[PDB]
C-alpha cells in the first residue's frame, strides 16, 4: 500500500535488473568437472547465492503487499518469479539429497529480465502469436511420425542385433554394421559369423525395437540428420531392394511437405497481421516522413542555387573567399565525375585487397602494403573534402556516409594497431567494398534496394529485441545443458569439443544444435553419459525440445523480419511511383488549365504519355491479397526443295515421333554401364546411339533447309565428331569423354516441344530475374567475408601427420603410431586440411559448405586450432575466432536465405490467369459461388421401403453410437498395433495376434453389414468405403497367410501387414481443420505436375552426367564413394543425388572424386574422376534448392486465399457443412421440396452464416420477404436455390439493398459473368 507508491521509482527496477544481470554473469562463470572435482572459484561463487535469493525475496515481498495475491499472482511473470524464489529458498534450506531437480530452476533466472523489460514481453508476445496456427501442423507432423514408426515397427524390428563376431571368443564385433545370415544382406567377410546380439549401430539407440525407439528414430530421420546411416543399416541388414520405398516418402512427406505447410501457414499469418490497423498506421507514418524528406531535398537544392546566385551577384559588383571555395567544393562532390572516380578507386582497392593469397611474392606484399596507405589517404582526403563541402550535419544526414566514416576510423585504428603490433589483421579495410553498392544508383533498381534498407533501419529496435530474445533463450538452454550434462562427457577416450563443461562451450554446443548439424550425435553422446540405452533415454527429451522449438523459432525470427521489411520496401517503392505519376498527370492538367488563349497541345501529351507507364501492372498475388485485406479491414472499421521440307516439318504427326525418339534415346542413356565399358550391352547402346544421332541430324538439315536451335546443333554435331573419331584408335580420349558427356542434352529438347514445360521454365526464369539483384548483394557480402577469412586463416591450415611436430622442417622421417594396439612406423608428412582459406576461391568454397551446414564444426575446429603462418595446430588456441563463424551464421544462412524466400513469396506472379480482367469484382466470391454451381444436392439415399429388415440395418449402421464404437475400435486397434516389441514372451505375442484376429473380424463384420444396410453398388459409390473394403480384405489375406501355412521360399508376401496399418488414415476424418488443410495442399500439388517434371528432369540430367563422369571410381570403403553411395547405376546415382539434395555429406562426396582417385579394377582407364565435381556439386545444390523453393511458393500462393482467411465471412468452406446438414432431409433430387423444412434448416446449419443471435434473424426475416421470391410458382418449391444464393450475395459486395429496384442489371451482370455454364443455373437464379 504505502510502500508501493514510494518504492516503484525507476532506480529500484534498474537496481533489480542489475542484480539479475549479475546473477546471470555468476551463472555463466560456473565450471563443471568430472568425478566430483571442483574449482576453488566455484566455491567462491557458491557463497553469492544467499545475497541473490534475499534480494529476490525482498523484491517479491514488496509486490505482495501492493497487489495482494491470488492480484500480484495474477500475472504469469510474477508466478515465474515466485516459483524461482521459492525453489531458491527451498534449495538454501534443503540439506537433503534431493536437490538436482530443485537446483535446475536457476536456469530460469535469466528469464526474469524479460519480466523486467515490458518491451521484451511485447516482443515475446508478438513472436508467440505466430506459433498458435502452427500447433495443428505439429499435430499433423505427429500423425506422420507415428504412422511411419508403426511401419518401421513391422519391418525393421530386431534387425540390427546380428553382427560379425570372430569365433565367439569375447564378443568383439569386427565391424559396426549389421549383417545377414546367407542372404541378399551384407555377408560376413573372412571367418566371422553373424551371431546374435550386438547393442546396435549408435550405441543401440537408433533402432525399431519398440514404439518409443521407432518414434525417436523416425523423428531423427525427418530432420534430414543422419537418415542415410539408418537407410544403409537397413540395406546391409535386409537388402537394398525395397528400403528406399520406406525412406524416400518419409523424407518427402515428413520433411519437404511439412516444411511447405509451415512456410505457407507462416506467410499467411504474416500477410494477415501486416494489414492490422496498428501496423498500417505505422507504415503510413514511415511513408509520410520519407515523402517529406524527398521534397525537402529538392527545396534545399533550390535554396542553395539561389544563395550561390546571390553571392555571385554580390561579389561580381576573408569570409567571402572561403565561402566561394566552400561552394565550389560543395559542387565538385555532387557531379557524376566525382561519383565515377570514387567508384573506380573503390573497385581498384577491392581488386588489390582481393589478390591476397598464401605464399604470394614479397614484391606483391610490399606493393599492397604501400597501396593500403595510398588508398587510405585518398579516402581520407575524399571524406574531408566532402564533409567540408556539404557540411558536417549534411554529411552525416545520409546513412551511407556514416558507414563510410565508421569504416574510415576503423581502418585508421587497424593501421595504427598493426603498426604498434605487427601480426593479426582485424579485416576492416575490406568493408570499403560495400561502397561499391553505389553502382546500383545508376540503375533502375535503386528505389527498391534503398527502401529495404530504409525499412530495415526503421526497425532497429524490433530486430535488436528479437535478436536479443533469441540469445536469451540460447543462454537459458545452455545453462540447462550445463546443469544436466555438466562434466559428465568423460565416459570415453577423450571429452568431445561439443561439451557442456564451461559456459562458452555449452553455448557454442547449443548454437551448433540449433544449426542442426550433428545434433543426433550429441544426443547419442549425452544419452550414453546419462548411462546406456536403458536408463538414459529421458535425457533425449532435452534435444528434441531444443531441436523443435529451435528449428521453428529461428524460422519465426528471421523469416518474419524479412517478410516484414521486404514487403514494406515493396509497398514504399510502388507508392513512390503512384504518388509521382498521379501528380505528374495533375501537372499536365494545370499546364492546360493555365492556358486558355491558345489551343493547348499538352492536353493530348498526357493522354499519349499516360498509358506508357500503366503497362507494368504486375501486382503479384501478395499485393492483391494485401489490397483485399485492406478493404476488408477498413470495411470492418466502418461498420464497427524448300516446300518439301516445309511440308515435312509442318506435318501434324511429326512432333510425336521426334518426342518418342528423344525419350528412347534418354532411356538408352539411362541404361548404361559406366565401369564395364567392354560389355555387349554397351555395344548395343553404341549401335542405338548411331541410329539415334543419325535421325537427329536428319531432322536438323531439313529443319534448317527452310537459341534452342543452337542447343540442338551442338548436341548433334557433338555426337558427329565422336563418331568421326570413333572409327580409329583411341584418339584424344579426353575429347571422346567430353563428347560422350555432351549427349546428356537430349531431354532438354523437350523444353520447347511441350508448351507447358516451356511455360514452367519461363516461370523459373522470371523468378530468378525477380531476385538477381539480391543475389548480387549476397555475392558481394560473401566475397567480403571470404576476404576477411583469407586474411584471418591463410597458411594456418597445415598439419603434420604426428601432432608432436609443429614445423615443416621437423615433419620429416618416420614416427611411431599407436593404433589397433600395435605400434607401427608411419611416414611423417606435412599435409593440408581439405577445406581451407588459402585464397579467395578456396575461402568462398569453404564458406559455401559452411552455409549449407555440412561439416562446419570441423572447419570451426580447424580455425580455432590455427596458430600461425607456418605452424601446426594447437588445440583451443583461439576460441574467440568462433565469433566469426557465429556472425556468419547469423547473416547468410539465417538472414539472406530468409530474405530470398520472402522476396520470392511476395513477388510471385499469377500464372493461372495471366491477366487482371475477368470480372474485376470477384476473387473468392466466384470461387464460393462455383462450389454451389457445380455440386448437385447430394443426398444420403435413405431407404424407400423401411419394412422390417433393411431399415433395421440402415438405422443401426447410421446410428451415432455405431460410429462412436467404430472409432473406439480404430483407437484400440492402433494402440494394440504399436504395442509389440522385441523378444516379447510367446504368450504376449499370441495375445497380440488374437487381438488382431478379433479386430479384423469386427471390421469385416462392419464391412459386410454396410452392404446389406445400403446395397452392393450403393456401398462402393463412395471412394472411402472401397478403401475400407480393400484394407479389410488385405487384413483377411494377411491373417490367413499368418495362421495357415505360409509361402515357404517363393516370392515374398510380407507387405500385407501394411494393410492393418492403413486404418490410421481412417481416423484422419475427425481432424476437420487438419483434413481440409491436407486436402487443399494435396490438390494444389496435383495441379502443378509440370514443375515436378522439371525437377525430375534436373535429377535425370545430373544423374546421367554423374554416371558418365564419376561412374568408375573405385568402390573402396572408408571414403564417401563406397558400396552404399556411388555413381555405378542410374538408381544409385539418383539416390546419391537425393542424399546430396537433402544434404548429408555432399562436400565429402565432392572430395571423394577429384582427379586423383584410385580407379576401378574392371574399368578400362587408369585415371578416373575429375575436378568437374567442384562445379558439379556446387551448381546442383544451387539449382535443386532453387527449384524446390520455386515449387513450394508455387503451391503456397495457389492456396493463399485459404492461408489468409480471417474467418468472419467464410463462404468456400461452409458450403460443405450446408450440404452435410441438407442431406439429412432430402431423400433424392425430387426436383422440388416442400416449404416447412427450410424454416428449420435456417437453424440446422451453422448460425454464423445467416443469423448469429436472435437479433440477426431479423435480417434473415428480411431476406425471405420484402423482395420477389419464387412463391410465384407452386407453393412447395425449393429455396436452396434462393437461400444460400441470397446469403452469399448479400454477405459481401451488397448493392441491391439500398436500391431494391435494379435487380435486372445485377442479374444480367451475373449471367454475363457465367455466360457459358450450359444454361443450368437459369432455374437456380430464380
Amino acid at each position: 500500500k504505502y510502500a508501493k507508491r514510494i518504492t516503484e521509482w525507476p532506480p529500484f527496477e534498474y537496481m533489480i535488473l542489475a542484480t539479475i544481470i549479475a546473477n546471470c554473469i555468476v551463472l555463466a562463470l560456473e565450471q563443471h568437472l568430472p568425478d566430483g572435482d571442483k574449482t576453488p572459484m566455484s566455491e567462491r561463487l557458491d557463497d553469492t547465492e544467499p545475497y541473490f535469493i534475499g534480494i529476490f525475496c525482498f523484491e517479491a515481498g514488496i509486490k505482495i503487499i501492493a497487489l495482494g495475491f491470488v492480484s500480484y499472482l495474477r500475472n504469469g511473470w510474477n508466478v515465474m518469479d515466485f516459483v524461482v524464489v521459492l525453489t531458491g529458498i527451498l534449495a538454501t534450506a534443503g540439506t537433503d539429497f534431493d536437490l538436482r531437480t530443485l537446483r535446475a530452476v536457476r536456469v530460469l533466472r535469466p528469464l526474469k529480465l524479460v519480466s523486467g523489460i515490458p518491451s521484451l514481453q511485447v516482443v515475446l508476445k508478438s513472436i508467440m502469436k505466430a506459433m498458435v496456427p502452427l500447433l495443428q501442423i505439429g499435430l499433423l507432423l505427429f500423425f506422420a511420425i507415428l504412422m511411419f514408426a508403426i511401419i518401421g515397427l513391422e519391418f525393421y524390428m530386431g534387425k540390427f542385433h546380428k553382427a560379425c563376431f570372430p569365433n565367439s571368443t569375447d564378443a568383439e564385433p569386427v565391424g559396426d554394421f549389421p549383417c545377414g545370415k546367407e542372404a541378399p544382406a551384407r555377408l560376413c567377410e573372412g571367418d566371422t559369423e553373424c551371431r546374435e546380439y550386438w547393442p546396435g549401430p549408435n550405441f543401440g539407440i537408433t533402432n525399431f525395437d519398440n514404439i518409443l525407439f521407432a518414434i525417436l528414430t523416425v523423428f531423427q530421420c525427418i530432420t534430414m540428420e543422419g537418415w542415410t546411416d539408418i537407410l544403409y543399416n537397413t540395406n546391409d541388414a535386409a537388402g537394398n531392394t525395397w528400403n528406399w520405398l520406406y525412406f524416400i516418402p518419409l523424407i518427402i512427406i515428413g520433411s519437404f511437405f511439412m516444411l511447405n505447410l509451415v512456410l505457407g501457414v507462416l506467410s499467411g499469418e504474416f500477410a494477415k497481421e501486416r494489414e492490422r490497423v496498428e501496423n498500417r498506421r505505422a507504415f503510413l507514418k514511415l511513408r509520410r516522413q520519407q515523402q517529406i524528406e524527398r521534397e525537402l531535398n529538392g527545396y534545399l537544392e533550390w535554396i542553395f542555387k539561389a544563395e550561390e546566385v546571390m553571392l555571385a551577384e554580390e561579389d561580381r559588383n576573408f569570409r567571402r573567399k572561403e565561402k566561394m571555395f566552400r561552394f565550389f567544393i560543395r559542387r565538385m562532390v555532387k557531379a557524376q565525375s566525382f561519383y565515377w572516380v570514387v567508384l573506380c578507386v573503390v573497385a581498384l582497392n577491392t581488386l588489390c585487397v582481393a589478390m591476397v593469397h598464401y605464399n604470394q611474392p614479397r614484391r606483391l606484399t610490399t606493393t599492397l602494403y604501400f597501396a593500403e596507405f595510398v588508398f587510405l589517404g585518398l579516402f581520407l582526403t575524399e571524406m574531408s573534402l566532402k564533409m567540408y563541402g556539404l557540411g558536417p550535419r549534411s554529411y552525416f544526414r545520409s546513412s551511407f556516409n556514416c558507414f563510410d566514416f565508421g569504416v574510415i576510423v576503423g581502418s585508421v585504428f587497424e593501421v595504427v594497431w598493426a603498426a604498434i603490433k605487427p601480426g593479426s589483421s582485424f579485416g576492416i579495410s575490406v568493408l570499403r567494398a560495400l561502397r561499391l553498392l553505389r553502382i546500383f544508383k545508376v540503375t533502375k533498381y535503386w528505389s527498391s534496394l534503398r527502401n529495404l534498407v530504409v525499412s530495415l533501419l526503421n526497425s532497429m529496435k524490433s530486430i535488436i529485441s528479437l535478436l536479443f530474445l533469441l540469445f536469451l533463450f540460447i543462454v537459458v538452454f545452455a545453462l540447462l545443458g550445463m546443469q544436466l550434462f555438466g562434466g559428465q562427457f568423460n565416459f570415453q577416450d577423450e571429452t568431445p569439443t561439443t561439451n557442456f563443461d564451461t559456459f562458452p562451450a555449452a553455448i557454442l554446443t547449443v548454437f551448433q544444435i540449433l544449426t542442426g548439424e550433428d545434433w543426433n550425435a550429441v544426443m547419442y553422446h549425452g544419452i550414453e553419459s546419462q548411462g546406456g540405452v536403458s536408463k538414459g533415454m529421458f535425457s533425449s527429451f532435452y534435444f528434441i525440445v531444443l531441436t523443435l522449438f529451435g528449428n521453428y523459432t529461428l524460422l519465426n525470427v528471421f523469416l518474419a523480419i524479412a517478410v516484414d521489411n521486404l514487403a514494406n520496401a515493396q509497398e514504399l517503392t510502388k507508392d513512390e511511383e503512384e504518388m509521382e505519376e498521379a501528380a505528374n498527370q495533375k501537372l499536365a492538367l494545370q499546364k492546360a488549365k493555365e492556358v486558355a488563349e491558345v489551343s493547348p497541345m499538352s492536353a493530348a501529351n498526357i493522354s499519349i504519355a499516360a498509358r506508357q507507364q500503366n503497362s507494368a501492372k504486375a501486382r503479384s498475388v501478395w499485393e492483391q491479397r494485401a489490397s483485399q485485406l485492406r478493404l476488408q479491414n477498413l470495411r470492418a472499421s466502418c461498420e464497427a526443295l524448300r516446300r518439301f521440307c516445309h511440308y515435312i516439318v509442318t506435318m501434324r504427326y511429326f512432333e510425336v515421333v521426334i518426342l518418342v525418339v528423344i525419350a528412347l534415346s534418354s532411356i538408352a542413356l539411362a541404361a548404361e554401364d559406366p565401369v564395364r565399358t567392354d560389355s555387349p550391352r554397351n555395344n548395343a547402346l553404341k549401335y542405338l546411339d548411331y541410329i539415334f544421332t543419325g535421325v537427329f541430324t536428319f531432322e536438323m538439315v531439313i529443319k534448317m533447309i527452310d537459341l534452342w536451335n543452337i542447343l540442338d546443333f551442338i548436341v548433334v554435331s557433338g555426337a558427329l565428331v565422336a563418331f568421326a573419331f570413333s572409327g580409329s584408335k583411341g584418339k584424344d580420349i579426353n575429347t571422346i569423354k567430353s563428347l560422350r558427356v555432351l549427349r546428356v542434352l537430349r531431354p532438354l529438347k523437350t523444353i520447347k516441344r511441350l508448351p507447358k514445360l516451356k511455360a514452367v521454365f519461363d516461370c523459373v526464369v522470371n523468378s530468378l530475374k525477380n531476385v538477381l539483384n539480391i543475389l548480387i548483394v549476397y555475392m558481394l557480402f560473401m566475397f567480403i567475408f571470404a576476404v576477411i577469412a583469407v586474411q584471418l586463416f591463410k597458411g594456418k591450415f597445415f598439419y603434420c601427420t604426428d601432432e608432436s611436430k609443429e614445423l615443416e622442417r621437423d615433419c620429416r622421417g618416420q614416427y611411431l603410431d599407436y593404433e589397433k594396439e600395435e605400434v607401427e612406423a608411419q611416414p611423417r608428412q606435412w599435409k593440408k586440411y581439405d577445406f581451407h582459406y588459402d585464397n579467395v576461391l578456396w575461402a568462398l568454397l569453404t564458406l559455401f559448405t559452411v552455409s549449407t551446414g555440412e561439416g562446419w564444426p570441423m572447419v570451426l575446429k580447424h580455425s580455432v586450432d590455427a596458430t600461425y603462418e607456418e605452424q601446426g595446430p594447437s588445440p583451443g588456441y583461439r576460441m574467440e575466432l568462433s565469433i566469426f563463424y557465429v556472425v556468419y551464421f547469423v547473416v547468410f544462412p539465417f538472414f539472406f536465405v530468409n530474405i530470398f524466400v520472402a522476396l520470392i513469396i511476395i513477388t510471385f506472379q499469377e500464372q493461372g490467369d495471366k491477366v487482371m480482367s475477368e470480372c474485376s469484382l470477384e476473387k473468392n466470391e466466384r470461387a464460393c459461388i462455383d462450389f454451389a454451381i457445380s455440386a448437385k444436392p447430394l443426398t444420403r439415399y435413405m431407404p424407400q421401403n423401411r419394412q422390417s429388415f433393411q431399415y433395421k440395418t440402415w438405422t443401426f449402421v447410421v446410428s451415432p453410437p455405431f460410429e462412436y464404437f467404430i472409432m473406439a475400435m480404430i483407437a484400440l486397434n492402433t494402440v494394440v498395433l504399436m504395442m509389440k516389441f522385441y523378444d516379447a514372451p510367446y504368450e504376449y505375442e499370441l495375445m497380440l495376434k488374437c487381438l488382431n484376429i478379433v479386430f479384423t473380424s469386427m471390421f469385416s463384420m462392419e464391412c459386410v453389414l454396410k452392404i446389406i444396410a445400403f446395397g452392393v453398388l450403393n456401398y462402393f459409390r463412395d471412394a472411402w468405403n472401397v478403401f475400407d473394403f480393400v484394407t479389410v480384405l488385405g487384413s483377411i489375406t494377411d491373417i490367413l497367410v499368418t495362421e495357415i501355412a505360409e509361402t515357404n521360399n517363393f516370392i515374398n508376401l510380407s507387405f500385407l501387414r501394411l494393410f492393418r496399418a492403413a486404418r490410421l488414415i481412417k481416423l484422419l476424418r475427425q481432424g476437420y481443420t487438419i483434413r481440409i488443410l491436407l486436402w487443399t495442399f494435396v490438390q494444389s500439388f496435383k495441379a502443378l505436375p509440370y514443375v515436378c517434371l522439371l525437377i525430375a528432369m534436373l535429377f535425370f540430367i545430373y544423374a546421367i552426367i554423374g554416371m558418365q563422369v564419376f561412374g568408375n571410381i573405385a568402390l573402396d570403403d572408408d571414403t564417401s564413394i563406397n558400396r552404399h553411395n556411388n555413381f555405378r547405376t542410374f538408381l544409385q546415382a539418383l539416390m546419391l543425388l537425393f542424399r546430396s539434395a537433402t544434404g548429408e555429406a555432399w562436400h565429402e562426396i565432392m572430395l571423394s572424386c577429384l582427379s586423383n582417385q584410385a580407379c576401378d579394377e574392371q574399368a578400362n582407364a587408369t585415371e578416373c574422376g575429375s575436378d568437374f565435381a567442384y562445379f558439379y556439386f556446387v551448381s546442383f545444390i544451387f539449382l535443386c534448392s532453387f527449384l524446390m523453393l520455386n515449387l513450394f511458393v508455387a503451391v503456397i500462393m495457389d492456396n493463399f486465399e485459404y492461408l489468409t482467411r480471417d474467418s468472419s465471412i467464410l463462404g468456400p468452406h461452409h458450403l460443405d457443412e450446408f450440404i452435410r446438414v441438407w442431406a439429412e432431409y432430402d431423400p433424392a433430387a425430387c426436383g422440388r421440396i416442400s416449404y416447412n423444412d427450410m424454416f428449420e434448416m435456417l437453424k440446422h446449419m451453422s448460425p454464423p452464416l445467416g443469423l448469429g443471435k436472435k437479433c440477426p434473424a431479423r435480417v434473415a426475416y428480411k431476406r425471405l420477404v420484402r423482395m420477389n421470391m419464387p412463391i410465384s410458382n407452386e407453393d412447395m418449391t425449393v429455396h436452396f436455390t434462393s437461400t444460400l444464393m441470397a446469403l452469399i450475395r448479400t454477405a459481401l459486395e451488397i448493392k441491391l439493398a439500398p436500391a431494391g429496384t435494379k435487380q435486372h442489371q445485377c442479374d444480367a451482370e451475373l449471367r454475363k459473368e457465367i455466360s457459358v455454364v450450359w444454361a443450368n443455373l437459369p432455374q437456380k437464379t430464380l
Binding site: 559396426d176 554394421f177 577423450e494 550433428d518 553422446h525 601432432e803 564444426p857 570441423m858 572408408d1118
Partner: peptide
C-alpha cells in the same frame, strides 16, 4: 589428427581427412 581407417569418435572432429563414419576415420 587421426589417419585413414583409425578408430575415432564422431564428436571429436579429429580425422585428418573425411568424416568419422561408423567409428572409423
Amino acid at each position: 589428427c587421426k589417419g585413414k581407417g583409425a578408430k575415432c569418435s564422431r564428436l571429436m572432429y579429429d580425422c585428418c581427412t573425411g568424416s568419422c563414419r561408423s567409428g572409423k576415420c
